[PDB]
Design a protein around this ligand. Structure first.
Ligand SMILES: Cc1cc2nc3c(=O)[nH]c(=O)nc-3n(C[C@H](O)[C@H](O)[C@H](O)COP(=O)(O)OP(=O)(O)OC[C@H]3O[C@@H](n4cnc5c(N)ncnc54)[C@H](O)[C@@H]3O)c2cc1C
Ligand SMILES: Nc1nc2c(c(=O)[nH]1)N[C@H]1C(S)=C(S)[C@@H](COP(=O)(O)O)O[C@H]1N2
Ligand SMILES: O=c1c(O)c(-c2ccc(O)c(O)c2)oc2cc(O)cc(O)c12
Ligand code: MOS
Ligand code: FES
Ligand code: FES
Lengths: 756, 334, 164
C-alpha cells in the first residue's frame, strides 16, 4: 500500500536519462512533412493579399495552406468565434493566416519568413482602458452580491477606494505546443499525437474542420512537458492546422512551435484591472466591499467567462465580508486570446483582495496579521456566494505557519534592519489562501477510467486525465494498487487516448486526482467483485491464480469506472447551491530585502503550511506547492509581458521574459503539509493541490510592498498611513520608482521636489 | 521525501573515456576547411595570414566564433550571410598575454576564459591594480549561463555593439586597448566614445578584424565600478549598464580624469563627456555629486517617446549608479 | 570541393561529408542521429534544455578540456575534432543510470521532465571539471537552465550531496 508514501514520479528515471518520449521525440515517418504557421503582423487589419511566390522558391517547399483549403468548417474555438485560418481580416498580431508545408522544419521556417502579406489597418483596441472607453466587451456584466452595500458604507468609520492592475503571464512550459497528425487514407481516419490537456476538444475540433464524424479521429497523449492551462484549449491552434496539412497532402505532418511563436500566438494569463471601494471600522473589521473587475480577454471568448466567474468566487479570499458586490466584465481586444493559466482567475482576484486588505491595515495603523486574523472566516461560515465552509483549516495553517516561521521574532529583526539601513530595506508578510475545488461548469465534473487485467495478472489502467508533470499517473497507480491490494509493479498506465476513454473533460481545475481517482477506484471495485468467488474458492492462492481461474471460467476482466461529483450547481440568479466540492487552504510567510537604489530584491525566506488533506503522495504534493508558489512569485515579481503601442508583443523569449531561475528562489524555502486533516470528500481523504498554492507567491509581493513602505518612511515623507498604488508585477522599475527619494525627484541636482 | 544514504556513490575514474581516435587525430596538422551549404559557404581559417587573405578577398565575409549572436540574427532577424569565416582555431585570437600595462586576450577567447583569468589576477594582485578587472567580473557575474559563457567570445561582444552590452561600457570607461588588423594594416586604439558611431556599428573597415583586447591594470589613485539594471524587457535597448572610472591627482581627492559610460540610454554605448569634463580639478564631495547628477539628468535625458520606455526608472538608475560609485570611491579613498 | 566534417557523439565517430554551415548541433543530434534526449526549449540560448557537454584536446593549452554548451546555437561546422556527450552518453535505465540521473530522479527534481536532460548535463559537466565541487559552484552551474515545474529546491537538494 503506497498511498501516503513519497513515491517518485514513475517516469522520473526515464526523464533524467532522456528516454521519456515527448511528442517531437516520436520518430518521423519516411514521408513526414513539417508545417510552419503564417501569422499576422498587425493588431487589426484587412488582409489585401498573401504572396507565396518567394516561398515557392524555397527548396523542399510543398504548399501554402489557407482558409480556402479547408474541406469542412473554418469556424472553431470554444464558442465558435474563431477561424482556423483568418480570411478577410486579422484581429491580433499573433493571428493565424495560413501555414507553410515543407520537407524539413528548417525549410518550413525559411518559406514562412518570406510569405508576404499586405494589409489595410483598422482601428485597434489593445488596453483594458481602450476597451472600456469603446465599450468593447464579450457578453454582459457578471455579478455576485450579498448584504446591503449602502447600509455597509454608512456604518463604516473609513472608506478607501482605488484602482489596481495585474499584468498577464506566459505559460512558459518547457515543451512548446506540438502535434503530429497521421492520415490513414481510409474513411477520413486520422491519428494524432499531441501535447494537449484536452484530447476531447482536439478530436472534436479536428473532426469539425475536416467535416468528418468524431469517431474517425483518434487523439493520443503520452505526456506533456508542462501544460499549466495553456494546453487546455489553445493546443488546437496547432493541431487543427497540422490535421489540415495531413488531410491535404496525404502525408504524416508535424509542427512543434519555436518559443517566439508560442508566446505570440497561444495566449497567456488574463491581465486584470480592478476598481475597488472598501468600508471598514477603525478596528480593521470589513463592513462593505465593492469591486469591479475587468479582464483583457483578447480576440476571442475561449475560457474568459469561466475565468471571470472563478475570480468572483475568490474575491473574498479568506475574509468574512457582510456586505459585498463584485462585478466582472470581459474586454474584447486585438491581442491573442487569453486562456487558462494555473489558478484560472483565482490569483488575480485573490491579489486584488490582499491589496485592499493591506491598505485597510495601513489606514487603521494596525499590524497586518491582526487585521487579517480578525477578518478571517470561521468554521461553518457562508461565503459571499452562500457556500458553507466545512473543515475550514486556515486558522490551523495560520497558527502553525506563524510558529514555525518564527514570524514575530523575525518581524523585530526586520524592524531593526530597517532602523539600521538607509538604502536597503526588509519586508515580511504572512498571507492565507482558499481555493475552490471543482469545475464551476457543473458538466465538466465527470471522469472515466477503463481497466483491463491480463491473464498474467498484469493490469492496464486508462483514465481521462493527462500527465503534464503533476504526477497524475503516479497517483492513479498508487490508488489502483491500494484498491486492488496488489503491488504497484503489477500496474501500468501507458497514455491517454480518445478510443479508451471518450468525452473526457480537460485535465484542469486541479480536480484530476479527485475525479479520475474515483473512476479508477470504482473500476477496481468492479474487478474485485468479479474475482471475489475465486478468492473464496482459493483464499491462500495468488492474485495470478485468481485472475487465471476467472479467465478460465469466462468472467470478464475488463471494465469501465465513472465518477460524477455530487451536489454541484451554483445559481447566479438565486446566489445559491454549491459551486465547489470543498476548498484547499494554505498560508505562506515571506521575507525579502530590496535595494532602494536599484529596485533589485532578494527573496530571503519563505515558509508555507498547506492543507492537502491526507496526501496520496507527500513528495508529489510538496513538489506541487513549491512549483506553484514559484510560478506565483514569477507572476507577481519577475514576469512581465510588454507590447508596442501598436499591440505587438516585444517579450518573446527567455532573453526578454524572465521566469524564475535557480537563483530566484528564497534562500530558506520551507514547506509543510498540515497533519491530521483528512478530507472526507475526496479519494482516500486527499485534497487537490495543483493550483491552490500559486497565489501564495503573492506573500513575496506583499513583503516587497512592506519594504517599499519602509523606504518611503525613510526618504519620501512622514505620512505613516499613506496608500500608494503598486501594480503587479513588482519589477525593478516599479519597486525603484516607488522608493521616491532625492534621485527619483531630482532634488539631488539642486531642484525642488516631492521628497523630504 | 528521499534517502541520500541509498544513492550510488560517484566514481570519477569510471567516466566515459575521451575518444582515443580523436586523441590520435590531434597530431594532424591543422588546415583550412571549406563547407558548402544550400545558402552558405563556411571557411574554417587555420592561420591568421589565411584569415587576413580571406578577408581581403571577401570583405563581405562574416566572422563567426561562438555564433551566440550570428545564430540569433539568422534565425530571428532572417539575415543571411552567404560567406562565413570561423577563426576560432587561430592561436593569436586565443592568446592570453600578461604585459606591463594590462592583460591581453585574443578576440576569440571565451568569456569563461576571461573570467577564469581575471579571477586569478584578482586573487593574486594587490587590490589597487585590479579595479578594472573587478569591474569586468561584476558585469560577468549574472550574465547568461555557463553554456553561453563557454562559447561566447570577448571580441564577439565588443563588435556586435549592442546598445545594452554590459562589457562595452566598462571597456570604454577604462580605455581598454583594441588591436585591429587587416592584410597589411595593424593599429591599436583605446576604446572611446568614437568607436561606436551608429547603431550596431564600430569604427572598423570592412576588411579589419579585432585581434586582441588589453584590459588595463588600474593605477594608484584610480578607482572603478560597473553596475547594471537587473531587468530587460526589449531585445537590444533600454537596459541601463555602466562602467565608471576616476583618476585623482597623486594622494588627493582632486579629479584628474573621469569617465562615465552607459549602455541602454541611446542606440549605442555612450560617454557622459560634457558632464565629466566639467568635474576636472574638482574635489570628490557633495558639490561634485550634485553637479554630476545635474549633468547626467541633462546629457542623458530621454524624450517621453524614447524607444524602450521606462523613462523615469532609467534616468533614476543613471543617477543612482553614480551615487553608488561616489560612495564606493569615498570608502576606497577615506 | 567541400571537406569532410568529423566529430564524435557519445564516443562514436560522425563523418559528415556534406555539412551545411546552417546546421545546428541540436538539429543534427535530433533529426540526423536520432538522439532525442537533448531538447528544444527556445532556440536562443536562454533555457538550457539543449545543454550538452563538449570535450576537445586544446592544442594551445596542451590539455583535454570539458565544457557545457547550448546545442541550439552550436553550428556543427565549429565542431571539427570535437567530442559531444549528450544525456544518453552518460547512463540509461537500460544499463545503469549515472549518479547525476539517479539523484535528480530520486530527489523529486523532475516533474514534467523536459528540462531534466539539460540540467543533468550541466551537473555532469561540473563534476567532470571538479569531482569535488562546493555548494556554491553547484548553484552556479545552473544559471543557464530553466525549470517551470519544480521551483528548483529539490534539484539543488539532490545535487548538494555531491559537494564538499
Ligand atoms: C542567452 C545569452 C545571454 C546573453 N547575455 C548577455 C548579457 O547579459 N550581456 C551582454 O553584454 N551580452 C550578453 N549576451 C551576448 C553575448 O555576450 C554575445 O552574443 C557574444 O559575446 C558574441 O560572441 P560570439 O563569439 O558568440 O559572436 P558571433 O555571433 O559568432 O559573432 C558576433 C559578431 O562579431 C563579429 N566578430 C566576431 N569576432 C570578431 C573579430 N575578432 N573581429 C571582427 N569581428 C568579429 C561577427 O562577425 C558577428 O558580427 C548574451 C547572449 C546569449 C545568447
Ligand atoms: N509539473 C506540472 N505541474 C502542474 C501543471 C503542469 O503543467 N506541470 N499544471 C497545473 C495546473 S494548471 C493544473 S489545473 C493541475 C492539473 O492537474 P491535477 O488535476 O492532476 O492536479 O496541475 C498543475 N500542476
Ligand atoms: O478549465 C476549465 C474549463 O475548461 C471550463 C470550460 C467551460 C465551458 C466549456 O464549454 C468548456 O469546454 C470548458 O470551465 C472551468 C471552470 C473552472 O472553475 C475551472 C476550470 O479550470 C475550468
Ligand atoms: O485549470 Mo489548470 O489547466 S489552469
Ligand atoms: S533550446 Fe533553450 S538554450 Fe538551447
Ligand atoms: S521538470 Fe518541467 S520544466 Fe523542469
Amino acid at each position: 500500500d503506497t498511498v501516503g508514501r513519497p513515491l517518485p514520479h514513475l517516469a522520473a528515471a526515464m526523464q533524467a536519462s532522456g528516454e521519456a518520449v515527448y511528442c517531437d521525440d516520436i520518430p518521423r515517418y519516411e514521408n513526414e512533412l513539417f508545417l510552419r504557421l503564417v501569422t499576422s503582423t498587425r493588431a487589426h487589419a484587412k488582409i489585401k493579399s498573401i504572396d507565396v511566390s518567394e516561398a515557392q522558391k524555397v527548396p523542399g517547399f510543398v504548399c501554402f495552406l489557407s482558409a480556402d483549403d479547408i474541406p469542412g468548417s473554418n469556424e472553431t474555438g470554444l464558442f465558435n468565434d474563431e477561424t482556423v485560418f483568418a480570411k478577410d481580416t486579422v484581429t491580433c498580431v499573433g493571428h493565424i493566416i495560413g501555414a507553410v508545408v515543407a520537407d524539413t522544419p528548417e525549410h518550413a521556417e525559411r518559406a514562412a519568413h518570406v510569405v508576404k502579406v499586405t494589409y489595410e489597418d483598422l482601428p485597434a483596441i489593445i488596453t483594458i482602458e481602450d476597451a472600456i472607453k469603446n465599450n468593447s466587451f464579450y457578453g454582459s456584466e457578471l455579478k455576485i452580491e450579498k448584504g446591503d452595500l449602502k447600509k455597509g458604507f454608512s456604518e463604516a468609520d473609513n472608506v478607501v477606494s482605488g484602482e489596481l492592475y495585474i499584468g498577464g503571464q506566459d505559460h512558459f512550459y518547457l515543451e512548446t505546443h506540438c502535434t503530429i497528425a497521421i492520415p490513414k487514407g481510409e474513411e477520413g481516419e486520422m491519428e494524432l499525437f499531441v501535447s494537449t490537456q484536452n484530447a476531447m476538444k482536439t478530436q472534436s475540433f479536428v473532426a469539425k474542420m475536416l467535416g468528418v464524424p468524431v469517431n474517425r479521429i483518434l487523439v493520443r497523449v503520452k505526456r506533456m512537458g508542462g501544460g499549466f492551462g495553456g494546453k487546455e484549449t489553445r493546443s488546437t491552434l496547432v493541431s487543427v492546422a497540422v490535421a489540415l496539412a495531413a488531410y491535404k497532402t496525404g502525408h504524416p505532418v508535424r509542427c512543434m512551435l519555436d518559443r517566439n511563436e508560442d508566446m505570440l500566438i497561444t495566449g497567456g494569463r488574463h491581465p486584470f484591472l480592478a476598481r475597488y471601494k472598501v468600508g471598514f471600522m477603525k478596528t480593521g473589521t470589513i463592513v462593505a466591499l465593492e469591486v469591479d473587475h475587468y479582464s483583457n480577454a483578447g480576440n476571442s471568448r475561449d475560457l474568459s467567462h469561466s475565468i471571470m466567474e472563478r475570480a468572483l468566487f475568490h474575491m473574498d479570499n479568506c475574509y468574512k465580508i457582510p456586505n459585498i458586490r463584485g462585478t466582472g466584465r470581459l474586454c474584447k481586444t486585438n491581442l491573442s486570446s487569453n486562456t487558462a493559466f494555473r489558478g484560472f482567475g483565482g490569483p488575480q482576484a485573490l491579489f486584488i483582495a490582499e491589496n485592499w486588505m493591506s491598505e485597510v491595515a495601513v489606514t487603521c495603523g494596525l499590524p497586518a496579521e491582526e487585521v487579517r486574523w480578525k477578518n478571517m472566516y470561521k468554521e461553518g461560515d457562508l461565503t459571499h456566494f452562500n457556500q458553507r465552509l466545512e473543515g475550514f483549516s486556515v486558522p490551523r495553517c495560520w497558527d502553525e505557519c506563524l510558529k514555525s516561521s518564527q514570524y514575530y521574532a523575525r518581524k523585530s529583526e526586520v524592524d531593526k534592519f530597517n532602523k539600521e539601513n538607509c538604502w536597503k530595506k526588509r519586508g515580511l508578510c504572512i498571507i492565507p489562501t482558499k481555493f475552490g475545488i471543482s469545475f464551476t461548469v457543473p458538466f465538466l465534473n465527470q471522469a472515466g477510467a477503463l481497466i483491463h487485467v491480463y491473464t498474467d495478472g498484469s493490469v492496464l489502467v486508462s483514465h481521462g486525465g493527462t500527465e503534464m508533470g503533476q504526477g497524475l499517473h503516479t497517483k492513479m497507480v498508487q490508488v489502483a494498487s491500494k484498491a486492488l491490494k496488489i503491488p504497484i509493479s503489477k500496474i501500468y498506465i501507458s497514455e491517454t487516448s480518445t478510443n479508451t476513454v471518450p468525452n473526457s473533460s480537460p485535465t484542469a481545475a486541479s480536480v484530476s486526482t479527485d475525479i479520475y481517482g474515483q473512476a479508477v477506484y470504482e473500476a477496481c471495485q468492479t474487478i474485485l467483485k468479479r474475482l471475489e468467488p475465486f478468492k473464496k474458492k482459493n483464499p491462500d492462492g495468488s492474485w495470478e491464480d485468481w485472475v487465471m481461474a476467472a479467465y478460465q471460467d469466462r468472467v470478464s476482466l475488463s471494465t469501465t469506472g465513472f465518477y460524477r461529483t455530487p451536489n454541484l450547481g451554483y445559481s447566479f440568479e438565486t446566489n445559491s447551491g454549491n459551486a465547489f466540492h470543498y476548498f484547499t487552504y494554505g498560508v505562506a510567510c515571506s521575507e525579502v530585502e530590496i535595494d532602494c537604489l536599484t529596485g533589485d530584491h532578494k527573496n530571503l525566506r519563505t515558509d508555507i503550511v498547506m492543507d492537502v488533506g491526507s496526501s496520496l503522495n507527500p513528495a508529489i504534493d510538496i513538489g506541487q506547492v513549491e512549483g506553484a508558489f514559484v510560478q506565483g512569485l514569477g507572476l507577481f515579481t519577475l514576469e512581465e509581458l510588454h507590447y508596442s503601442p501598436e499591440g505587438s508583443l516585444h517579450t518573446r523569449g527567455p532573453s526578454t521574459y524572465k521566469i524564475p531561475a535557480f537563483g530566484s528562489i528564497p534562500t530558506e524555502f520551507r514547506v509543510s503539509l498540515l497533519r491530521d486533516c483528512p478530507n472526507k470528500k475526496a479519494i482516500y481523504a486527499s485534497k487537490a493541490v495543483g493550483e491552490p498554492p500559486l497565489f501564495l507567491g503573492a506573500s513575496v509581493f506583499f513583503a516587497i510592498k512592506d519594504a517599499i513602505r519602509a523606504a518611503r518612511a525613510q526618504h519620501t515623507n512622514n505620512n505613516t498611513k499613506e496608500l500608494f498604488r503598486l501594480d503587479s508585477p513588482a519589477t525593478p522599475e516599479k519597486i525603484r520608482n516607488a522608493c521616491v527619494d532625492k534621485f527619483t525627484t531630482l532634488c539631488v541636482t539642486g531642484a525642488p521636489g516631492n521628497c523630504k | 521525501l528521499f534517502n541520500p544514504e541509498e544513492f550510488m556513490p560517484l566514481d570519477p575514474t569510471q567516466e566515459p573515456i575521451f575518444p582515443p581516435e580523436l586523441l590520435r587525430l590531434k597530431d594532424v596538422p591543422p588546415k583550412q576547411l571549406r563547407f558548402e551549404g544550400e545558402r552558405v559557404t563556411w571557411i574554417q581559417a587555420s592561420t591568421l595570414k589565411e584569415l587576413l587573405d580571406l578577408k581581403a578577398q571577401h570583405p563581405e565575409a562574416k566572422l563567426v566564433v561562438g555564433n551566440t549572436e550570428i545564430g540569433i540574427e539568422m534565425k530571428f532577424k532572417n539575415q543571411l550571410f552567404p560567406m562565413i569565416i570561423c577563426p576560432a582555431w587561430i592561436p593569436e585570437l586565443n592568446a592570453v598575454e600578461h604585459g606591463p600595462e594590462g592583460i591581453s586576450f585574443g578576440a576569440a577567447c571565451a568569456l569563461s576564459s576571461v573570467e577564469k583569468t581575471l579571477l586569478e589576477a584578482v586573487a593574486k594582485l594587490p587590490t589597487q591594480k585590479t579595479e578594472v578587472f573587478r569591474g569586468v567580473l561584476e558585469q560577468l557575474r549574472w550574465f547568461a549561463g555557463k553554456q553561453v559563457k563557454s562559447v561566447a567570445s570577448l571580441g564577439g561582444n565588443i563588435i556586435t555593439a549592442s546598445p545594452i552590452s554590459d562589457l562595452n561600457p566598462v571597456f570604454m570607461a577604462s580605455g581598454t586597448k583594441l588591436t585591429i588588423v587587416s592584410r597589411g594594416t595593424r593599429r591599436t586604439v583605446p576604446m572611446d566614445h568614437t568607436f561606436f558611431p551608429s547603431y550596431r556599428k564600430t569604427l572598423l573597415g570592412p576588411e579589419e578584424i579585432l585581434l586582441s583586447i588589453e584590459i588595463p591594470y588600474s593605477r594608484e589613485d584610480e578607482f572603478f565600478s560597473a553596475f547594471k539594471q537587473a531587468s530587460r524587457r526589449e531585445d537590444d535597448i533600454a537596459k541601463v549598464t555602466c562602467g565608471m572610472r576616476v583618476l585623482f591627482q597623486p594622494g588627493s581627492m582632486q579629479v584628474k580624469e573621469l569617465a562615465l559610460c552607459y549602455g541602454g540610454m541611446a542606440d549605442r554605448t555612450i560617454s557622459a563627456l560634457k558632464t565629466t569634463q566639467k568635474q576636472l580639478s574638482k574635489f570628490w564631495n557633495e558639490k561634485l555629486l550634485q553637479d554630476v547628477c545635474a549633468g547626467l539628468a541633462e546629457e542623458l535625458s530621454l524624450s517621453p517617446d524614447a524607444p524602450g520606455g521606462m523613462i523615469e526608472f532609467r534616468r533614476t538608475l543613471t543617477l543612482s549608479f553614480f551615487f553608488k560609485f561616489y560612495l564606493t570611491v569615498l570608502k576606497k579613498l577615506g | 570541393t567541400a571537406d569532410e566534417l568529423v566529430f564524435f557523439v557519445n564516443g562514436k565517430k560522425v563523418v559528415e561529408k556534406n555539412a551545411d554551415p546552417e546546421t545546428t548541433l541540436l538539429a543534427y543530434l535530433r533529426r540526423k542521429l536520432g538522439l532525442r534526449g537533448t531538447k528544444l526549449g527556445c532556440g536562443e540560448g536562454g533555457c538550457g534544455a539543449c545543454t550538452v557537454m563538449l570535450s576537445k584536446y586544446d592544442r594551445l593549452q596542451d590539455k583535454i578540456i570539458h565544457f557545457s554548451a547550448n546545442a541550439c546555437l552550436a553550428p556543427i561546422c565549429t565542431l571539427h575534432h570535437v567530442a559531444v556527450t549528450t544525456v544518453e552518453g552518460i547512463g540509461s535505465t537500460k544499463t545503469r543510470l549515472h549518479p547525476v540521473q539517479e539523484r535528480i530522479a530520486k530527489s523529486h527534481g523532475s516533474q514534467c521532465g523536459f528540462c531534466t536532460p539539460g540540467i543533468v548535463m550541466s551537473m555532469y559537466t561540473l563534476l567532470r571539471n571538479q569531482p569535488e565541487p562546493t555548494v556554491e559552484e553547484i548553484e552556479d552551474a545552473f544559471q543557464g537552465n530553466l525549470c517551470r515545474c519544480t521551483g528548483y529546491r529539490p534539484i539543488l537538494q539532490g545535487f548538494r550531496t555531491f559537494a564538499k
